[PDB]
Design a protein around this nucleic acid. Sequence first.
DNA 1: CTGCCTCGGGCAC
DNA 2: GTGCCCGAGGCAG
Lengths: 209, 213
Amino acid sequence: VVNPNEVFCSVPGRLSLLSSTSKYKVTVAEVQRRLSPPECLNASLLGGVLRRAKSKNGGRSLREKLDKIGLNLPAGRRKAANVTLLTSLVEGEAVHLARDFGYVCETEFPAKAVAEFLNRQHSDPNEQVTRKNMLLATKQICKEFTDLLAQDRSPLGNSRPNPILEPGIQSCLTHFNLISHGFGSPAVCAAVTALQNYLTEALKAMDKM
Amino acid sequence: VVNPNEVFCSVPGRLSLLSSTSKYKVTVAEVQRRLSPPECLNASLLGGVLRRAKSKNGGRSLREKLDKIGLNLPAGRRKAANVTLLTSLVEGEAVHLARDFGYVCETEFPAKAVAEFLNRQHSDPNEQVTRKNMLLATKQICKEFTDLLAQDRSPLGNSRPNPILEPGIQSCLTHFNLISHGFGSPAVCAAVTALQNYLTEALKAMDKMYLSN
DNA sequence: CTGCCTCGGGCAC
DNA sequence: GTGCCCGAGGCAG
Ligand SMILES: NC(=[NH2+])NCCCO
Ligand SMILES: NC(=[NH2+])NCCCO
């Protein structure tokens, strides 16, 4: 449980069917990320992220709620320059969606059929050692890439872990965290799971011959 | 315009802020995909996908609407327990979410900073020829992998294109289309553009190492 | 874009 | 599994 003093509000997930998920907690720290660069969301956009009724002067109620817990959101703030579907997500549901994508990549992506099909496009007996080395090289480069993304210690929810990466690379990974509400790096890792399962199945199928 | 006779209903996007998207059209074809293997959604889950009010006899009216277009959904069909957050999506929003993921992987993923960091972890002179060849092999294998996914001709929306792949592999790709509502293969291609950009920037930072120092 | 008032869906049963 | 009624947000304007 997050300290209730740190909870700005609770928000029902956007992507749940038949009340599959409990509401997500949205912390002061999360709201502060949405209000700060690079997004600088305004009252109207943040009201949408928080799934709040569009009421007369709802802008004004949200801005007074923020003022009480120490965040200043001016009435005159323009709409953000770059909005995607990821901008709607609360950080809990963004992380949950990336884990779901990782789950479907691991359990539904046809890695073995893809391996058999692509191995079949290279049936010259004199290119098998080359293809095998290209596949091993791909598995190792992709592992180093996803090991770096897994060392991301960008703040999410009420967490602010000590960084393990140097500040330069951590500020760049934090930028990708902020525009994606935490979806980006874990979703990239989720997809590379489909690629790594293909590469595993391709090596396994070659090694049978 | 999609023939209105082929449109089951229109569904407001779940991930749109401040009315940024038109309602998505849901074709009869899309509904038939959700009701058929592998998902076999029941009336209650399909009602959530279509974002319909849980009204008195909502199940019955949905099943009557489905019989009028020739789709038989038995009232006793078991409730699928392997639903994910992707199961909530209409196909138009699933593809739009994959397109936006592709857009942030192309424009906001810090491929150059990641290239510089990972080149620095493997910066010994004695490994720079092997690293270059591993980076180049990674680019070629990844491009071949995304080229196969780009040849998927799974039905989506009102589209039923002629397959360009053999039926076996097309069948397997369609399975991943159906469980992800069209998100899966495009989202995997989106992420692999972030990896491809890292590989390009890693090769260019090695090429320009002298001028960089 | 604002915000009313329809109707989606969290919730209790 | 059903479906009320609060309140999110679709849509009118
Ligand atoms: N959650 C994730 N980023 N997924 C990667 C691993 C899939 O089991
Ligand atoms: N995924 C499923 N097959 N579940 C649905 C059960 C109803 O036949």
